[PDB]
Design a protein. Structure first.
Ligand code: SAH
Ligand code: SAH
Lengths: 333, 339
């Protein structure tokens, strides 16, 4: 631990060259892989069954910064880079268009954005389809505030609900429900999918994007006492990392209609772009953090928090040419 | 067209039993290797996408497109004409049958008073076994063959198993107003096409809290119509005519959960089916005294009886090599329990 604590202190202060940080991240990822893979497909399949059965015993459960690091859509999730020259702003729009296509959004439908973030998707379909009725759901006051203000822009077809989702109930029915990278923060997917399914009209569809590993699934919990990486961005226990196949195991109340995966290079590049915008803008970010926080030290730590955020995303999803950790798209009916 | 003539001669020689086993095996491995190169994709996105093409394509199709004295020689005492389960290097075919049958009963969670449907029952090994272990179960076997029906009913009577019933039906067109607490499908789906139509039909036969247990052969990762990769592929049609079978992926029926919902998934190493076929080949070879004359008096003459020998040798060697390939970690069996 003390070696871990010393590295962590060095990272907080920004004293480690990026090349060294990536090298150390890869060491941990290599170990995750050896831990994740099994010598036998029987074991590999059994491990998924262990995780899904125990999940079934559980319960479900600053804007000037974002405008700098994110593209102009404020999409705080995976973007889509066809072509080497694709920019972040193009990659946001492409990913957003991809959701519309795969989730089969059509002009006069009621659309639900479950876990809307901030809220690139709801604003995107609301503007593209003036006869859609779009509902965004979030448990953040700040986010609800922003999407409401941004909805003008003269958008009359946007509604935001401030709710927990874990505990939330409602009478309403939607033709299309979109969940982009929400489930990683949930646990009992059986109960979650059951709630959401009551919100889907009979001929409606649920579209889900989640991060994953192509073969194994796990609690994002540190591997052992010197896995400094698993808790470098998130506190342990807050996230799960599904396999590409994971939600094929949760079809009690919905039924899989299509399944795609996208290479980890996309999310890797996404983070890369975020990091470039961060490092190219410390001139305004540092004072901003200094004001928001109390002092210089805490502002310097916050900066390197965001660095580690991006670097984690870069190396993890870019590992082995994006052919280990990736994105999965699932359409249910 | 040199390649092609070479192939007609190889088949000529294999048909007359002129090629040594080790050479046959080597030749089979070369075809298996090309299958793997064809089935595996450079990116997982393409791999996943290849599955979808197949499952979406099957939904566009229709539901679908041997002397017992021979079976008693080559199979074990249960006449299980499907995968058996070998723990221990010393395990015999008869034991591997039992062990496998008991595994079905456990993973299918059979309880003693339930109604049980054995869909596509072959020679009745599972129906006879269930009816014997669980005396209060009503067991119903289904088959489209009058021979198999006769044999199973006669074994019921003989073994004193009154809780057996055999229905003569084509599962493709079959309809009934019955409902069963548990339904067992052992290696029938490889002969069907539209799994959405088939599983909807079967799901109607499950009672409310009932379960469906399925065993199927598969590849770990990819799925395919059992058809020749290309004109050099003599192996894919070496045993079955083309278009008669489908090799699913381990995960394949996970994509057909419109009407049933997966509760559990397991897989078994390919070594088990590989040893199954090996025991079958051993028995075929140690009993030619009986089998050759039996084939002769059932075929045109002596030559036809020989090519029939070698056709079965091909059946077992295909099974051996395919499922034992890469230590049983490519082609294998999948068990799926649905509710
Ligand atoms: N329990 C909960 N109830 C409602 N919303 C939640 C939630 N937990 C997380 N969220 C929302 O889900 C988001 C996960 S990040 C995904 C945001 C969005 N799909 C985008 O990428 O642009 C959080 O930012 C928050 O807005
Ligand atoms: N269309 C159909 N209708 C009813 N039964 C069929 C069928 N097509 C195949 N079958 C049955 O399905 C079997 C496939 S082999 C599986 C048999 C058995 N489960 C065992 O392991 O021994 C055939 O033996 C035949 O009895």
């Amino acid at each position: 631990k003390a070696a871990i604590v010393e590295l962590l202190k060095q990272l907080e202060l920004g004293l480690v060259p990026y090349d060294d940080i990536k090298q150390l991240i890869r060491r941990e990822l290599a170990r995750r892989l050896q831990w994740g893979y099994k010598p036998t497909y029987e074991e590999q399949i059994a491990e998924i069954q262990n995780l899904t059965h125990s999940l079934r015993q559980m319960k479900i459960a600053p804007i000037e910064f974002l405008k700098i690091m994110n593209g102009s859509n404020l999409k705080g999730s995976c973007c889509y880079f066809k072509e080497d020259s694709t920019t972040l702003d193009e990659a946001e729009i492409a990913m957003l268009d991809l959701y519309c296509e795969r989730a089969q959004i059509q002009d006069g439908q009621s659309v639900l954005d479950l876990g809307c973030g901030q809220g690139a998707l709801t604003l995107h379909v609301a503007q593209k389809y003036k006869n859609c009725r779009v509902t965004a759901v979030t448990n953040s006051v700040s986010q609800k505030e922003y999407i409401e203000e941004e909805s003008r822009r003269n958008l009359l077809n946007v509604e935001v609900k401030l709710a927990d989702i874990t505990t939330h109930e409602m009478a309403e029915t939607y033709d299309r429900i979109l969940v982009i990278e929400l489930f990683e923060h949930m646990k009992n997917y059986e109960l979650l999918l059951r709630k959401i399914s009551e919100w889907i009209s009979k001929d409606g569809l649920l579209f889900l994007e989640h991060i994953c590993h192509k073969t194994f699934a796990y609690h994002y919990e540190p591997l052992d006492d010197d896995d400094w990486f698993t808790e470098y961005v998130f506190p342990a226990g807050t996230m799960i990392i599904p396999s590409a196949s994971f939600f094929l195991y949760f079809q009690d109340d919905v039924s899989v209609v299509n399944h795609w995966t996208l290479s980890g290079k996309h999310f890797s590049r996404t983070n890369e772009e975020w990091l470039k915008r961060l490092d190219a803008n410390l001139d305004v970010i540092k004072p901003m953090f200094e004001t928001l926080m109390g002092n210089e030290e805490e502002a310097v730590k916050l900066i390197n928090y965001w660095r580690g955020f991006c670097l984690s995303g870069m190396e993890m999803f870019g590992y082995n040419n994006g052919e280990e950790w990736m994105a999965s798209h699932v359409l249910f009916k």
